[PDB]
């Protein structure tokens, strides 16, 4: 004997079982929807036990057409996704069904998407610097090979243009395997990425898992765990170095808030779920590099209403080795990639790790930009000239540095038509050393926009 | 110095994981030895004897107003039963179940009739009009006190009328001298509706017409008192678990004799020579007469386990194996 | 610092070889001891002689 | 080797004994999200530890007329309706003892470092009440942190509570890890009055941050005397709520024995967020900012239980360095201003100072230490006895005179002295100055030798 | 006959009684805790009648180890505390048990904690000026001998150092009796007061009651009423003039807010209890002094988030005759004692009572400091030399008046190293009458900072 | 069916001075059962010489706010 | 044994119309309709339609589309 649906509340379905047969937490439960054009098998995940043999489930498909009293069969295991070397080159939904050809991967080894994070005995800190070739990133926000990286930003500032830049910077030359989690981002980007990886020939070594916007909050949260389960298999069993892009991990906590208001748990601050820092914790800790084996995460984090104090950005900020806080203000100047130099940070920007010269240069740049941001309240009223000479000298090079942190990215060619540029770390440190020492104050500010390195700054200054 | 300490902690983790491994091998071999040893029936009898000798050496769910009103209602039912007879009592219980169905359906009448009030005369007059022709006078005499008292919720009136209909039905067993028979049938039905999880969940039909469940019991499930108790209970089930309701009927039936039920777990077939001593030691421990609901099961092999009230005394090869294996360093 | 780190890495290799040889030698005796330990525990779990 | 390895298990087997005494059993009737409601248990105490069948423990926070609202302290995934729950016969307590020095432990006092089991000295209840006014003593001996910007200007004494409040990525963990590392030159003396023991309570840190802190302490020898109580962000809001009390109880045991203890809480804003989650799953009405009403009596009951004891109680002490993350650098926020009022001083680490080269980044105006010149050696009270007031007046005058075309002869002399003091109070991480070097460093500034 | 515990939920305990035996509101109930080191008698106060013979109670001591269905006996009367001459020179908790010598108070007359405030017929307004010898207090906020004084301030703005200085100034010379209430104050400063009063030998006339913040919401509420009912004994039964210090009186209403949700009251604006102005009024009105018998209250009021719009500060402001008003803005400038000169106020500051020579000078200082705060926005951006010669002269006077309101307090010996000072009122008025008419514009701005009057101002100016 | 409707109507229509009794008291409110003919804003009097306003009328109780000396109220007090 | 199983099948073998049990401000709750699908379009007697959102244990929480003024207690919903 098996269970029955008792109550339905959008994507949340309460089902009762016999007295003894009650499932565990996180079991996959199948149900049937038997109306017309929308007839589908329904995958439920058990989120709570309400008592009296009721269990409250989250639906991984839309529940439209589900009747009360239909039979619900416990599978006796969690949601399981295909893992293996043969997973690379395909596109999967949260449930591990291939989108390209639904019969694929049903015969692979399946792993349950719910797993304990690695025990503290196996964790170690990662400090090796990742060369991206972007000036602002490699200078002020140096990324960590095997660390967690995030790209914070408002709406329409370039988080996904940075992610599809970093796929060209790293995942092309990176000898390992890449996983891409689409978590609640545009299905249009999921196609324009899939056909781009097919053209760049990177697709042969990446698996894409997509839980895009049109999906109900159950799968819009469980997609991140499914993509992470594919990356955990590449990390642990294949022994590969992994890249794991996740765009957009704010939609994980948003879909967690939506189901929490339907599970009927009391609202937290600004109506997030309680357990926000435990749901985010239980995702973000599995995505870590154990002692033998690295997993270079990179997570686009949306910031709602540009409110950087919002509980989801503020919760996720703790889990990260490098954060690239993109800004509306810098985007309004047209200074793409739009990275806010004073908000972004990296744990490896220490002289014991980056070296004495790189640290010294990065602190001189940050001091200059800090003094400029602390003059902005006078600049906005009076303009530049009313400052003291020691401040006006500073602000002229601050505006040149603020612009020279811009770059013509490889992803930007689809918008600007101009080609991309790569700047090595040595040339980045040298250029900002010369800028902060004041060797380039004679060049106009328009010479520094969207340009890659000193030889290209010279070429652009000649063009003016 | 950091290197010298790193070597010492590496040595310490080697001799630690050695002790974890030797302990795991010893416990798993000892589990195989005791699991083989537990195969003789004399070894099981020796284990239950060692537990029995060790044990030899060793309304309250309702709020105040409802509790006090139920105690006063039962104190009047004692007076009704003192001049009752089995042919009167069976009619009293059926009529009290009929009014409990009426209150459960006409939830407006129930909400008014359960109104907590000292000047309760209008509620009594409502009940007199509504019932005086429909039902016999002795039920009216008992419902006058059921309505005139104070209840903590509009549910607790129905819960008191149902409990009084259950008491009136038990009284037939107590006067006829079938009390041991009806208790054994109520435990039989309680264990079978706990081992049969389809029929008992379908018997929880408080979302469906109750007569379908009455017919289901009449087809699938005997002493006519136990059948009347089950049918009365499924009629008035109000979303309780059917097996848990039948167990609560058996708990009331034993509590009428002043005793209490200890559920007991063993390998199999605890002999009557064990049962007489086990009842005697349990009685000495808890200070009451007792009855044993023997729930034998092979997974808990060896020793004896018992549960009574909220508490347990749980000596078994399984429960002591878990205690030994968890205690590894 | 580099000389002391080289001495510490050498000490860690000498530990890895010592503990490998000891871990094999003590497990040789432990395989015989486990029968006596389990025989003793089969009594202490039953609560009587076995 | 082999004779001790077999002998330890032979002593264990010989000690193994029947569990045939009674116990009360409840049954779980609701469970999920890290809470469970337990039916039955007619005699369970408030804040009793409950044993669930998966080995996992919980705490009975609510006792209703027919249900017990248990919080689960562990992997709640194995909890489901209908399984049995045994009472422990024990108010919420953790093991304590000298064996915790150099270990990483759960908030239940069980190891997660992957070394052996902890040979605990005793249990201690987590809720034993603070030492009353007649049992305390005046804070009168210093914790040297080795940081000029603290020891000279916001000094920390044994039995102080000093709130290292700041924005994200401003050196809050760097100040506290440097404070724990600096105690090695005192620990090596072996004298129980100079010797300071440490506890670093990681609340909601990511596990590789806790492993980074651990190896930063191993490099400086601080794991000889430091316990880490790691509630990494992976674990349920029960552990994340409890971790400060497990740190406080492990500390209290040495403190009451006449040892000196230092506790770092990293971070109390994440304990307040975990207690909000726990309270909202138990469905208590939220107060302001969605926090529970008693979010003050979470942090006061935590922090007020550390102070210097009288000589009638062995004269031990415990010093708390709570940390708070101020969302968008507002000091005037609800949880910030609770902990600022519970503690004895602030080290407000302004991210704007931290960027303009002023690191450790102490906002000398708002930061304070209300014990003051009782938490300093006489020589530091001489050379620095007004240095916070001189530097806050300098930051006021430097804000005011930032646009004046000219200045008075004394105003110029003050504005040019402050710049010497601010450059003198800059300090690179992992460069702890001995107090005998700090007093000379400050002497150069306050006597004007740097002018 | 006795009752039993039914439900326990934090500090709130529900107790059921027999029909005839329900206790009146605010009775003390005793219940026993019987586990280990927690074993104590527990005191509960009856907060509500729930119906069905249930009463809801607040526990004066932690509910840890309390068991459902334990026996509860009602004391038949409210919580009562020892009163009499013999409570002077002892330290008590909220229950009236001596901390220093357990059992000391048990032979005294015990008075109930709860009583009505004095009748309106018994009240007369107080107009005697109290001289403290603090420049800012005696000039701008003159205290009323027999009035209800207060020290408002945000978290950490030094309120407890100022109240300990006010004890040391007033209660040291005062010929009557003093009481100190510790309501949710930091226990360290409760002990530093206790040893300081013993060393200064003032302890022989001072009764201290401490209900510090390590205590549950029941005692943080009832401690303020307990200390107050010792002060109300010295007022009424002995007619000897009283001082009543209270740090921190906000913690009374806060602890009320913490229980209110468990008491089943709905939360009001910013999550206070709804009874806030009726709880606080029923406390504060008892602190008044009737004709012929003064109580000089001195109560420090915490201000949550520094927000003087917060309902608890905003309700407390009605009950007070002189409100000193500390601020983090003035504190962050080092102008300790951190008194905000413009927010702070007194009812005795009028030319009928203080005299025109004081009143004119206090008003000229407030007018100057107000024009200076109107000018700080212009001075931060446009800059001082832009201003009129009259405005710029006023700014150079306000910057000196700001610093000359700061003082080396005797409690701030540890903050400053220099000993403290007392400035007589006549010298305070003469110094500010000179300052407002420019008689010190030739002195350096630093010479006024922390200095105890004109003789010390001259010695400091000639030291620079 | 119809008999229950007629009998409930006659019960409600069945409704010297009227008496209530306090069933709850807390924080300045006292819920009074009974008083079937009470009107909104009616001055109730309680046996200690206390007054309340009967400011809220529910299906079975009257939520009276208390005008003074509220500590003198108890569950089971006769309200006129 | 087998009699119980067969009886469970017989109970399982055994144009339904519901009734409005609450209405207010744009929503209505319907009792009955045991076989209604979630997000089924429901029709009320005034020709008004509604969307069956919250299918509870004993009620169907319907959003009303159009003139919810025409909806009231006891109206037949099909």
UniProtKB/Swiss-Prot annotation, chain B:
GO cellular component: plasma membrane; proton-transporting ATP synthase complex
Intracellular or extracellular location(s): Cell membrane
Bilayer topology annotation: Single-pass membrane protein
Keywords: ATP synthesis, Cell membrane, CF(0), Hydrogen ion transport, Ion transport, Membrane, Multifunctional enzyme, Transmembrane, Transmembrane helix, Transport
Region of interest called ATP synthase subunit delta, as start-end residue ranges on this chain: 59-329
Any one GO molecular-function label of the UniProt entry: proton-transporting ATP synthase activity, rotational mechanism
Similarity remark: In the N-terminal section; belongs to the ATPase B chain family. In the C-terminal section; belongs to the ATPase delta chain family.
Other facts: Binds 2-aminothiazole antibiotics, which are antitubercular agents.
Function statement: F(1)F(0) ATP synthase produces ATP from ADP in the presence of a proton or sodium gradient. F-type ATPases consist of two structural domains, F(1) containing the extramembraneous catalytic core and F(0) containing the membrane proton channel, linked together by a central stalk and a peripheral stalk. During catalysis, ATP synthesis in the catalytic domain of F(1) is coupled via a rotary mechanism of the central stalk subunits to proton translocation.
Quaternary structure note: F-type ATPases have 2 components, F(1) - the catalytic core - and F(0) - the membrane proton channel. F(1) has five subunits: alpha(3), beta(3), gamma(1), delta(1), epsilon(1). F(0) has three main subunits: a(1), b(2) and c(10-14). The alpha and beta chains form an alternating ring which encloses part of the gamma chain. F(1) is attached to F(0) by a central stalk formed by the gamma and epsilon chains, while a peripheral stalk is formed by the delta and b chains.
Designated name of the protein: ATP synthase subunit b-delta
Residues of the full protein shown: 100 to 444 of 445
